[PDB]
Amino acid sequence: KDEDIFILTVQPVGIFKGEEFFQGNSMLPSPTEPVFLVEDDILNKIFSNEKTKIFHLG
Amino acid sequence: AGECLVVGDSTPIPSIVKLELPNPEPRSQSIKFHKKWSESWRTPSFEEVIMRWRKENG
């Protein structure tokens, strides 16, 4: 009935307070709040990190 | 990590407590796999391992 709706259901898995990633389901975002996709710069910090004990698995 | 739920007759509300870090800690019976593998090839004293396999039968 001429009603363009595009609704996504997302689940929080962490926070990016500062430049480091914390886990936890807290700090609910207020309504009318931007969503900005994800860039590889923050994904690399979450996963690769920097430590001797690493193992590449794809 | 380090939190427990205390359920019993000695509390009015069984809850979860942020236990502090003990001082000093007990011995940690943990072996890290990759760091030991990261080192060069190690020599096991087969003589000792065999004599203790056979000597400790009861």
Structural notes for this entry:
This is part of a larger assembly, with 2 copies of chain A (58 residues). Chain A is 14% helix and 0% strand. Chain A has one helix at residues 40-47. Chain A has 1 helix and no strands. The first copy, chain A, is low in regular secondary structure. Chain A is elongated and about 55 Å long. The A-B interface holds A 52-53, 55 and B 32, 34-35, 38. The PDB classes it as antiviral protein. The entry lists the keywords nuclease, ATPase, 18-mer, antiviral protein. HerA-DUF4297 assembly 2. Chains A, B: ATP-binding protein.
Secondary structure topology:
This is part of a larger assembly, with 2 copies of chain A (58 residues).
Chain A lengths: L39 H8 L11
PDB class: antiviral protein
Keywords: anti-phage, nuclease, ATPase, 18-mer, antiviral protein
Entry title: HerA-DUF4297 assembly 2
Report the largest inter-chain contact: A-B, 3 and 4 residues
- Class inferred from helices and paired strands of chain A: little secondary structure
Oligomer: part of a larger assembly
Percentage of residues assigned to helices of chain A: 10-25%
PDB class: antiviral protein
Keywords: anti-phage, nuclease, ATPase, 18-mer, antiviral protein
Entry title: HerA-DUF4297 assembly 2
Chains A, B: ATP-binding protein
